[PDB]
Design a protein around this nucleic acid. Structure first.
Ligand SMILES: [Hg+2]
Ligand SMILES: [Hg+2]
Lengths: 87, 85
DNA sequence: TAATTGCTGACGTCAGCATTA
DNA sequence: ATAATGCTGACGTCAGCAATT
């Protein structure tokens, strides 16, 4: 079965490929990789979405960090201005 | 041939005039399939370009928060100079 | 009221690079 | 040294949307 093909032990599978011709063995060995690849690619898509968002979220954080540091610059500059004049 | 993707509407329709309905259906599809193959290549290109622009966007920020930190720690000592005076 | 076009999200394939058994 | 596994970049199909024809 397709499902059973994807799911069995490295050994369990070998002990089940006995009667099948050698060229045929490879076809199903390729089928196992191909099938397993279908799974990996899916999981990769999810991960990529997570990674896309993460970078997006970093950017958000860096921007508010920029605002806040600018807001600090300005106030530290108000104090320097007022103290510069008295001095 | 596969340069079927090349010929324009006007060029193409006239090319089609010889063929049967069924043949037309087949060729028109191969065209969209071919045309789409190139479209996909475009979407990938367009994507790397804007993937980069984003990398630069972050890099310019990671540094912008440096001159800002340095600018504040500069204004710290400069404000104080006129504070202590 | 169609058809064609261009683009993009999502998939499944395949090649490569490690990592693991 | 083999074989298998998982992940990922890039690709080609296909669907379905938007905007032209
Ligand atoms: Hg990924
Ligand atoms: Hg794109």
């Amino acid at each position: 079965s397709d499902d059973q093909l994807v799911s069995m032990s490295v050994r369990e599978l070998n002990r089940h490929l006995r009667g099948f011709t050698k060229d045929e063995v490879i076809r199903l060995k390729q089928k196992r990789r191909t099938l397993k690849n279908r799974g990996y690619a899916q999981s990769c898509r999810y991960k990529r979405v997570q990674q896309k968002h993460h970078l997006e979220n970093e950017k958000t954080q860096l921007i508010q960090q920029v605002e806040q540091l600018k807001q600090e610059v300005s106030r530290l500059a108000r104090e320097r201005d007022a103290y510069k004049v008295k001095s």
